[PDB]
Amino acid sequence: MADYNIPHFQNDLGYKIIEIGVKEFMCVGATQPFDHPHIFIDMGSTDEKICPYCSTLYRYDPSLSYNQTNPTGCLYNPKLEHHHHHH
Ligand SMILES: [Zn+2]
């Protein structure tokens, strides 16, 4: 990994069960009482991980891979905010 930037997903309203094809995730929230954007999530040996205080159960399923995700684009997409690794 470079610059330590793991995938982020976006809750439009917040689906109770989200299917993701990545085992590294960092929950968004920005201004939260929790430390960091919201909470840090990893799968590893547990392909089933819900996010505390969200209801957005991130489920990893063999039928979907890193190039796929859940119904509706719940993936957070950076549009113009991109840095080309500035030294
Ligand atoms: Zn969360």
Side-chain angles (χ1 to χ4, degrees):
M1 62 177 59
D3 282 39
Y4 186 67
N5 193 330
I6 51 182
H8 299 283
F9 288 84
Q10 54 172 30
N11 290 30
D12 56 340
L13 56 145
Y15 306 154
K16 311 179 197 306
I17 305 175
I18 290 297
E19 317 294 315
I20 62 174
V22 294
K23 303 188 184 69
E24 305 86 77
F25 174 71
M26 194 65 180
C27 182
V28 192
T31 51
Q32 291 291 271
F34 306 94
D35 181 29
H36 302 278
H38 195 229
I39 200 68
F40 41 87
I41 302 177
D42 78 281
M43 283 183 174
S45 303
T46 47
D47 299 283
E48 56 287 276
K49 280 293 181 60
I50 192 177
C51 180
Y53 302 94
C54 276
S55 304
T56 314
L57 204 170
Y58 305 100
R59 192 188 66 141
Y60 192 88
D61 190 280
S63 59
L64 57 103
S65 301
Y66 295 68
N67 291 89
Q68 279 190 328
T69 185
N70 64 271
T72 305
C74 302
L75 56 128
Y76 188 82
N77 57 92
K79 321 177 199 304
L80 297 180
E81 44 282 279
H82 287 114
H83 286 167
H84 197 255
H85 306 273
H86 185 79
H87 300 277

